[PDB]
């Protein structure tokens, strides 16, 4: 069971670099591809992400895609840069200039062939693959448009494998670019149907968590990428290590998604404690449980108390006991009987693993499928309406072959999605 990794754009490349750093740290791999580990289980499922070479070296199943060379040079010269195979670095020379239209039609169409050939090679190498992890943002033009084309082609070639997207959706309070809503809406239009499940993440809530709960005075992008990397490592632990009760990607996919279109998730991690306030904190499951379920800690810029939790999944790591897990789950379900759906009893999925994160005793990851996602989208749509009515910035995209009718479809599809989430709330 193998998973190949795809990264797109500057944001995706930075997130992926942090991920590969932490996971090589986890598995005992050094910075030069060597191995110096102790625990035997590290070798039991080392191949879920790595591929073997001559001389006893490992190289990851990674592809880096970008439309400019500066970020690729930065990742190559940075730490853990020699791990990757040089053939996997795929980058162009022109750039997109934050145009979705340029990213989809004019510039990415010429470069898509090389990356499809490389991912075809990686899928040839694998034994029996299951999933693709894609990392990007919905604000810029290169990542969003190029990755959308890439997902469309990949899905067309592979109709039975499972697909993952770990997106970043823009927020008005951390707004940075004058043409963000066009990018966001035009991407989501077909991200609705081309993927299997999508995790939503915001820079606004990440700043909130970093400043307040972490007590950080200087949150730089390294720390935000660090948080997202811990989530991404925590999702798929059941594959690389054993457990009393197991849950891989397909189990979560069948358990959390009641209808095909309702696959937009909000993650959370616990604990998150500062270096000085950890000495004064207990070590027990219940605190982890409320901290996950706390509305103050979620990594999406939306309040869950405005709706009801559709379904949830909890992933525990550490040596713990199952009775405690189920008692806490029923405690939360009974106390928060207002905030849980009624026509689906016992809305919690559970999993327990054995190997804890290095240097820590227990950890917990929460994935929630809720009804609040509509408010994360309507806030965007308004910003779109203030643009398309007076055709601001539209000629830049129209010069590339598009039309206003595609914007009409984009608005209509966003309306359909928000109506669908309002219907079942």
């Amino acid at each position: 069971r193998e998973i190949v990794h795809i990264q797109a754009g500057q944001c995706g490349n930075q997130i992926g670099a942090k991920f590969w750093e932490i996971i090589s740290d986890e598995h005992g791999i050094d910075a030069t591809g060597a191995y110096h580990g102790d625990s035997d289980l590290q070798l039991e499922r080392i191949n879920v992400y790595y591929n073997e070479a001559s001389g006893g070296k490992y190289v990851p199943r990674a592809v880096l895609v970008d439309l400019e060379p500066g970020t690729m040079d930065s990742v190559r010269s940075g730490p853990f840069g020699q791990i990757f195979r040089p053939d996997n670095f795929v980058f162009g020379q022109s750039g997109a200039g934050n145009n979705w239209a340029k990213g989809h039609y004019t510039e990415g169409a010429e470069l898509v062939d090389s990356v499809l050939d490389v991912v075809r090679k990686e899928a040839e190498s694998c034994d029996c693959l299951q999933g693709f992890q894609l990392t990007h943002s919905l604000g810029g033009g290169t990542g969003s448009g190029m990755g959308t084309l890439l997902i469309s082609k990949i899905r067309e070639e592979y109709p039975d494998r499972i697909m993952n997207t770990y997106s970043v959706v823009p927020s008005p309070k951390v707004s940075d670019t004058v043409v963000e809503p066009y990018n966001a809406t035009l991407s989501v239009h077909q991200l609705v149907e081309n993927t299997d499940e999508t995790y939503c993440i915001d820079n606004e809530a990440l700043y909130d968590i970093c400043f307040r709960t972490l007590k950080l005075t200087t949150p730089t992008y390294g720390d935000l990428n660090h948080l997202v990397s811990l989530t991404m490592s925590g999702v798929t632990t059941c594959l690389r290590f054993p457990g009393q009760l197991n849950a891989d990607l397909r189990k979560l996919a069948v358990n959390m998604v009641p209808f095909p279109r309702l696959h937009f998730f909000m993650p959370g991690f616990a604990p998150l404690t500062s270096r000085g306030s950890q000495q004064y904190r207990a070590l027990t499951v219940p605190e982890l449980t409320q901290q996950m379920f706390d509305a103050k800690n979620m990594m999406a810029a939306c309040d869950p108390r405005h709706g009801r939790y559709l379904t949830v999944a909890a992933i525990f790591r550490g040596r713990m006991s199952m009775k405690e897990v189920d008692e806490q789950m029923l405690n939360i379900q009974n106390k928060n009987s207002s905030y849980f759906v009624e026509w689906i009893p016992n809305n919690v999925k559970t999993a327990v693993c054995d190997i804890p994160p290095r240097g820590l005793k227990m950890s917990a990851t929460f994935i929630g499928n809720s009804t609040a996602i509509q408010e994360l989208f309507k806030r965007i749509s308004e910003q779109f309406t203030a643009m398309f009515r007076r055709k601001a910035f539209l000629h830049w995209y129209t010069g590339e072959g598009m039309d206003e009718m595609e914007f009409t479809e984009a608005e209509s599809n966003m309306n359909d999605l928000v109506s669908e989430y309002q219907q079942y709330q």
Partner: protein, 426 residues
């Protein structure tokens, strides 16, 4: 990725002189072209310890270029890059465009083409000129026409000097500054306009220099250009490419006249007491007392803006300061632009030149705003021209050179149409 700068006229040559000394200071290259990377954007290396720029100097008079030829920077340029004429335009638009233009317009174009054979990633051209004189108005307009026809979709930027309303030194300026609007309007991808008197005030008040001469003003403009291109020439936390910035700023094809400003500019002694932080400098970028053209944004509404920080800047306080500025009712934005900021952060601090009028800093900000205020900068001038056109003064000089009497009619009509557009969108 490379750029080619074209300097025209006395003003253009002077500004280019300042800029190229600035670049040589930045990249550790001695005046004789030898360096005791990233320089390929402006420089070409030939064999061993020799760099030459991608620049061309143009004039119809020999003096201003022979001063370069005898000067301290004689060894750095090719001899073939310095092109001179025999009779200047005599401050005539008609003589520049028609009689004396075609005598040289071919040669430089050929040279330009040679430069384009060296590059592999042509980004764009930078043009330095003014609307006052006859050389840098008419011949520069002809040059942009030829370049636009020959190259097409390549981006072209200009850095103009608009004539001041009160502090002017010539008699026939409005005719030149009105007949140049056609070829700037229909053949330019980005236009920067600057006034001399506003820079005079900035020198008087902020820098507290008793006697500003032209060197200081040219140095300020060179600083602005260097800060704009530092996104290409270096690497940092965020990146803003040229076409990225054109996409984010220009809302309509006919509206490409941003207003520029810079921060911080502080005298040497007064720098010690102030400790320059991000919030106050992003406040200073919005002061009407530091706007580089004598206009009041208070009578206009902001349409979009771009901020370019360099030094020690992190995105948290950038977001905080932008959110702070968004809460002011004095700084007004158009309604259909919920977010109107493009932001870029670089890593390399600006470098101070010896003998300069600016002090060493750890951070810097350059602001480029698209507003509807600058419309007034034409409306006053549109009076000065028309009043002088009532009696048909000076017109015989231009008529004798092939120009006809209706040309000014279309000039006035084009300015009326452009003012109407700025009125209607605003």
């Amino acid at each position: 990725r490379e750029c080619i700068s074209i300097h025209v006229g006395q003003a253009g040559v002077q500004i280019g002189n300042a800029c190229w000394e600035l670049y040589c200071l930045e990249h550790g290259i001695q005046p004789d072209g030898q360096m005791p990377d990233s320089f390929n954007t402006f420089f070409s290396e030939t064999g061993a310890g020799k760099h030459v720029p991608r620049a061309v100097f143009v004039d119809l008079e020999p003096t201003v270029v022979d001063e370069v030829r005898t000067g301290t920077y004689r060894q750095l340029f090719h001899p073939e890059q310095l092109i001179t004429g025999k009779e200047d335009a005599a401050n005539n638009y008609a003589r520049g465009h028609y009689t004396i233009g075609k005598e040289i317009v071919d040669l430089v174009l050929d040279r330009i083409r040679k430069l384009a054979d060296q590059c592999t990633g042509l980004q764009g051209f930078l043009i330095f000129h003014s609307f006052g004189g006859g050389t840098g108005s008419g011949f520069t307009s002809l040059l942009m026409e030829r370049l636009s026809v020959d190259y097409g979709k390549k981006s072209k930027l200009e850095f103009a000097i608009y004539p001041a309303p009160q502090v002017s030194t010539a008699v026939v300026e409005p005719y030149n500054s009105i007949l140049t609007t056609h070829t700037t309007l229909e053949h330019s991808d980005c236009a920067f306009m600057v006034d001399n008197e506003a820079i005079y005030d900035i020198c008087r008040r902020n820098l507290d220099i008793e006697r500003p001469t032209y060197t200081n003003l040219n140095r300020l403009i060179g600083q602005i250009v260097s800060s704009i291109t530092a996104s290409l020439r270096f690497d940092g936390a965020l990146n803003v490419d040229l076409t990225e910035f054109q996409t984010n700023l220009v809302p309509y094809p006919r509206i490409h006249f941003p207003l520029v400003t810079y921060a911080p500019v502080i005298s040497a002694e007064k720098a010690y007491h102030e400790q320059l932080s991000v919030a106050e400098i992003t406040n200073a970028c919005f002061e009407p007392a530091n706007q580089m053209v004598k206009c009041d944004p208070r009578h206009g509404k902001y349409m979009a803006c771009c901020m370019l920080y360099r030094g020690d800047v992190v995105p948290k306080d950038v977001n905080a300061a932008i959110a702070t500025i968004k809460t002011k009712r004095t700084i007004q934005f158009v309604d259909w632009c919920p977010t109107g900021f493009k932001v870029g952060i670089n890593y390399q601090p600006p470098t101070v030149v010896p003998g300069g009028d600016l002090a060493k800093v750890q951070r810097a900000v350059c602001m480029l705003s698209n507003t509807t205020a600058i419309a007034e900068a034409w409306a006053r001038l549109d009076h000065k021209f028309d009043l002088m056109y009532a009696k048909r003064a000076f017109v015989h000089w231009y008529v004798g050179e092939g120009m006809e009497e209706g040309e000014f009619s279309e000039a006035r009509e084009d300015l009326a149409a452009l003012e109407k557009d700025y009125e209607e969108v605003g």
